Design a binder for these strands. Structure first.
Ligand code: K
Lengths: 246, 157, 238, 49, 31, 100, 120
RNA sequence: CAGAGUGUAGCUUAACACAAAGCACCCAACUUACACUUAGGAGAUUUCAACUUAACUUGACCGCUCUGACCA
């Protein structure tokens, strides 16, 4: 007894009459690349993704963030191509690349990355950590306003808060130094919540900090709706997440 | 499983040509030539080797199957010259002749004209091109001569 | 019959006689390749003999021992001197011939490095036009056979051409300019066949007004705009 | 030799899922392969093909 | 062109030095 | 002999130019084959409409095409009145014989 | 103490990891990804980004691969990723590009081996 | 010269923006050679104006492909 396939079978579009004249992979890398592509496509048979892949909702995630910035691609592309020509024209650049002695300035890369791809990389990273799932019940937003939180440790050092880097409760004893780029006349609200700190209820959080009606970026002048409480992750309970939401 | 719709999803040997552990020459059809031997003879080994490499790579670009690429045995020739005011020939130079063969198959009847025009224009100086049809004699000419078989065969004669 | 007249043209080509000059970049690469080849090579027999000869000349100065030194009679550099003298005496053939300076576009001897195409002038409708040699197709003959026949019709020609394949390498379709434009004779359709000039040339009887041999670059001077566009497609200049 | 645990069967860590002379079934997630091509469960769970 | 594949070097690991020479043929042509 | 920094830099820059020069040689040779092929195919299609019988003969293989022999160009052309020296050619190729 | 996905011994690459460094090299660009075993990308560094491209003469050479490692190592620390596995092919591992990218990651603080799971 | 269609480097129903992408392609080393791998190389929106957006929409302007005129 046989049963007809429920859909197109693999290796079906291959014409078996002209096998000798057909192009072969010839390389392991070219097969793997095609293999990885086929594994990602939806199939009508049972697959590993069916049983182990997280069950994402079919409806797209509602965007609740700020509108994307408007940029002129034509002008932006023109300036970018011109810059590459200037860099490539320099003879000292070519010798450094040919002799493998050239390097990029990490400080400048981060400044540009923070202006360009920073927001989307932070969103992708926030989704991985489960913040959007827990904080907004799946709704996502692009953090388009860079937020720089730093805990003063000692008198000459700072402990910057990025997106998942570890900070100890001792370093976070006092309220952090919060600075962001804001225009005059705007108002902002800053809060600090421990997603995992709550002891009695699993789905609830702890509000460690709340500042409201902040004029511009002068966080000190905001109303202390909730005073600051340092994190208190319980012993043996694991690693908790504390998120600053501007 | 046999009864299930996914039966045969793991089949793969119909996608590979069968392997069989000399070689029959395929005579061409009315619209395609048979196995063709492209001989490249030059007094310089680098020029023959370089052009044989060019023809091989060009055939790959044109999807012309290259059956085999091989070198024929080198021929050394002594060049004696009659000395001035003398009747004795003295050794002047020793010139070696190097030959390379790029064996192709499946060349089209119409495209043969375009192929030949390209491979003659790029011919280096001092390199001779000779496109012949493959025969058993060409293949047998690559093997050592057997004197013992000749003596035993002579007795039968 | 059909309205369109069948014609068969012949693209007889004289392939380059001499190699083409190296360009400035090719010359730089050729010099580098020569340098690299010398750098990675072992000492040749000539180099070793010169070294030993220089060495054996030194020991004789240091010590009176002779050791026959038969081969030392002629040194390796002394041989190099004799070889150069014979070379300077031999005069090489001129790659640029007299026809290149006289600009005789009827002789094969000119422009040896480049490929040349044959052009014959034919008179149509009391008008002279430059065209590739052509003949009219006749029943009981392959279309290439018409091109093979064009050579026989050429005036006092002794040339052996090698035809490449049977398919045509181009076509030009034109309509008579209202002169004899009739339903029976709408126009013509020439089909070109490439051939290689193995050996031979025309006679010395009639040369100038008959034919010319021109490269692809200077091929437009003679042919017409539309006729040229169709001929510059299968005439390569690689 | 054959499948010892079919689709949907509960297994414990160490349970031999199948035995085979050749690789008819290949090991997936949380499935070890023995020296003799024996497929066994590395975790407690449900078998899936 | 003849220069398509004429710029080459000896592609061997061990080989003695070779010198460029003009081979004059019997009709006077050289290579 | 170790090469100087200036020499190795000059050789590296020259080879970088060689990649682009050879890239343009292939393009010219690759656009010429295309042009020839298109003109031939276009002519053959026009020859089928005009007369099918002639088209059938055109697409057949030519038995006299092969063997096709062509020598490469010379460095200098033949000399009209050049007398070569007298001499002999003595082939000294080693003959290999298979025993056993 | 989390489970790693053991098994898959007859195929390549392994799944027995929490995070892995995956390098994608194309004809024009070099990209390096850090992704969780579940398939989610955590951090990334690509020469397609203008922040990196503007400082590179070429985005396809060894220098580009070393630079991507240095940029990715910094982004890994900011995300809290201190450990990952790298699964190169035999030819990729021997390549000079990948050796320089690996050195950049280790110098940057990231360890290219993951600690053993604790079962007991 | 007229009338239509047509428009990213070779191909692509690549291009949401975070960005002109992927493959094809060229040189060198390895290989008898090919292939593979390594290390390098070259590239495009025809040009302007229109929520300024726009490779994408509408116009001209260029190049292209056919259909006629012109044609031997
Ligand atoms: K909790």
């Amino acid at each position: 007894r046989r049963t007809p396939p429920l859909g197109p079978m693999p290796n079906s579009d291959i014409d078996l009459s002209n096998l000798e004249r057909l192009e072969k992979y010839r390389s392991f890398d070219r097969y793997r690349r095609r293999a990885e592509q086929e594994a990602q496509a939806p199939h009508w048979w049972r697959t590993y993704r069916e049983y182990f892949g997280e069950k994402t909702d079919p409806k797209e995630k509602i965007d609740i963030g700020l509108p994307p910035p408007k940029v002129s691609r034509t002008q932006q592309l023109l300036e970018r191509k011109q810059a590459i020509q200037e860099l490539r024209a320099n003879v000292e650049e070519e010798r450094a690349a040919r002799l493998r002695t050239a390097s990029v300035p990490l400080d400048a890369v981060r400044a540009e990355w923070e202006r360009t791809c920073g927001p989307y990389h932070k969103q992708r990273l926030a989704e991985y950590y489960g913040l959007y799932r827990d904080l907004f019940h799946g709704a996502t937003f692009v953090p388009r306003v860079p937020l720089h939180v730093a805990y003063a440790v000692g008198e000459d050092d700072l402990m910057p808060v990025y997106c998942g880097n570890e900070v100890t409760p001792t370093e976070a004893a006092q309220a952090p130094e919060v600075t962001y780029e804001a225009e005059e006349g705007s108002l902002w609200t800053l809060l600090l919540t421990s997603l995992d700190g709550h002891l009695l209820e699993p789905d609830a959080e702890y509000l460690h900090w709340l500042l409201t009606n902040i004029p511009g970026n002068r966080v000190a002048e905001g109303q202390v709706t909730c005073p600051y409480l340092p994190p208190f992750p319980a012993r043996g309970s694991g690693i908790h997440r504390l998120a600053f939401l501007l | 499983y046999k009864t299930k719709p996914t039966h045969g999803i793991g089949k793969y040997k119909h996608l590979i040509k069968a392997e069989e552990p000399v070689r029959a020459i395929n005579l061409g059809t009315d619209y395609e030539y048979g196995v063709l031997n492209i001989h490249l003879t030059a007094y310089d080994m680098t020029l023959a080797e370089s052009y044989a490499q060019y023809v091989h790579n060009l055939c790959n670009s044109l999807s012309i199957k290259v059956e085999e690429s091989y070198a024929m045995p080198t021929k050394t020739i002594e060049v004696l010259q009659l000395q001035d005011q003398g009747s004795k020939m003295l050794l002047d130079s020793v010139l070696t002749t190097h030959e390379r063969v790029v064996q192709i198959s499946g060349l089209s009847a119409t495209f043969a004209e375009i192929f030949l025009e390209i491979i003659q224009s790029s011919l280096p100086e001092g390199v001779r091109l000779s496109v012949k049809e493959h025969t058993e004699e060409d293949f047998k000419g690559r093997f050592k001569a057997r004197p013992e078989l000749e003596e035993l065969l002579a007795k039968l004669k | 019959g059909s309205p369109w007249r069948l014609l068969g043209a012949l693209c007889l080509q004289r392939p380059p006689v001499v190699s083409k000059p190296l360009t400035p970049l090719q010359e730089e690469m050729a010099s580098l390749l020569q340098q690299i080849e010398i750098e990675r090579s072992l000492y040749s027999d000539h180099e070793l003999r010169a070294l030993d000869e220089n060495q054996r000349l030194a020991k004789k100065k240091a010590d009176l021992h002779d050791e026959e030194d038969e081969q030392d009679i002629l040194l390796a550099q002394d041989l190099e001197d004799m070889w150069e003298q014979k070379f300077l005496q031999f005069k090489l053939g001129a790659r640029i011939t007299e026809a290149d300076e006289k600009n005789d576009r009827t002789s094969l001897n000119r422009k040896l490095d480049r490929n040349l195409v044959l052009l014959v002038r034919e008179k149509f409708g009391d008008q002279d036009v430059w065209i590739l040699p052509q003949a009219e197709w006749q029943p009981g003959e392959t279309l290439r056979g018409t091109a093979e026949r064009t050579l026989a019709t050429l005036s006092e020609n002794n040339m052996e051409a090698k035809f490449l394949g049977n398919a045509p390498c181009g076509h030009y379709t034109f309509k008579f300019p209202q002169a004899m434009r009739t339903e029976s004779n709408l126009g013509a359709k020439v089909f070109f066949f490439k051939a290689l000039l193995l050996t031979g040339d025309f006679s010395q009887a009639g040369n100038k007004g008959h034919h010319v041999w021109v490269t692809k670059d200077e091929l437009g001077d003679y042919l017409k705009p539309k006729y040229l566009a169709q001929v510059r497609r299968f005439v390569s200049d690689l | 030799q054959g499948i010892k645990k079919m689709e949907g069967h509960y297994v414990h860590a160490g349970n031999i899922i199948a035995t085979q002379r050749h690789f008819r079934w290949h090991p997936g997630a949380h499935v070890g392969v023995g020296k003799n091509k024996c497929l066994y469960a590395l975790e407690e769970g449900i078998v899936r093909y | 062109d003849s220069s398509r594949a004429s710029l080459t070097r000896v592609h061997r690991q061990a080989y003695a030095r070779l010198y460029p020479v003009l081979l004059v043929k019997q009709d006077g042509s050289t290579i | 002999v170790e090469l100087t920094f200036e020499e190795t830099e000059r050789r590296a820059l020259l080879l970088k130019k060689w990649s682009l020069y050879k890239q343009q040689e292939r393009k010219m040779e690759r656009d010429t084959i295309r042009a020839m092929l298109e003109a031939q195919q276009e002519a053959l299609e026009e020859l089928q409409l005009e007369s099918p019988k002639l088209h059938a003969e055109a697409i057949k293989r030519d038995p006299n095409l092969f063997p096709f022999e062509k020598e490469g160009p010379h460095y200098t052309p033949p000399i009209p009145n050049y007398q070569p020296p007298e001499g002999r050619y003595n082939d000294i190729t080693k003959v290999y014989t298979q025993v056993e | 103490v989390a489970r790693k996905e053991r098994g898959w011994r007859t195929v390549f690459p392994s799944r027995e990891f929490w995070h892995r460094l995956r390098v994608i090299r194309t004809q024009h660009h070099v990209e390096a990804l850090v992704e969780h075993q579940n398939g989610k990308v955590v951090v990334s560094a690509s020469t397609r980004e203008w922040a990196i491209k503007k400082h590179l003469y070429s985005t396809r050479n060894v220098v580009a691969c070393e630079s991507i490692g240095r940029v990715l190592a910094q982004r890994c620390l900011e995300a809290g990723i201190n450990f990952m596995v790298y699964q190169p092919t035999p030819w990729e591992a021997a390549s000079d590009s990948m050796k320089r990218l690996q050195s950049a990651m280790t110098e940057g603080g990231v360890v290219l081996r993951e600690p053993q799971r604790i079962y007991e």
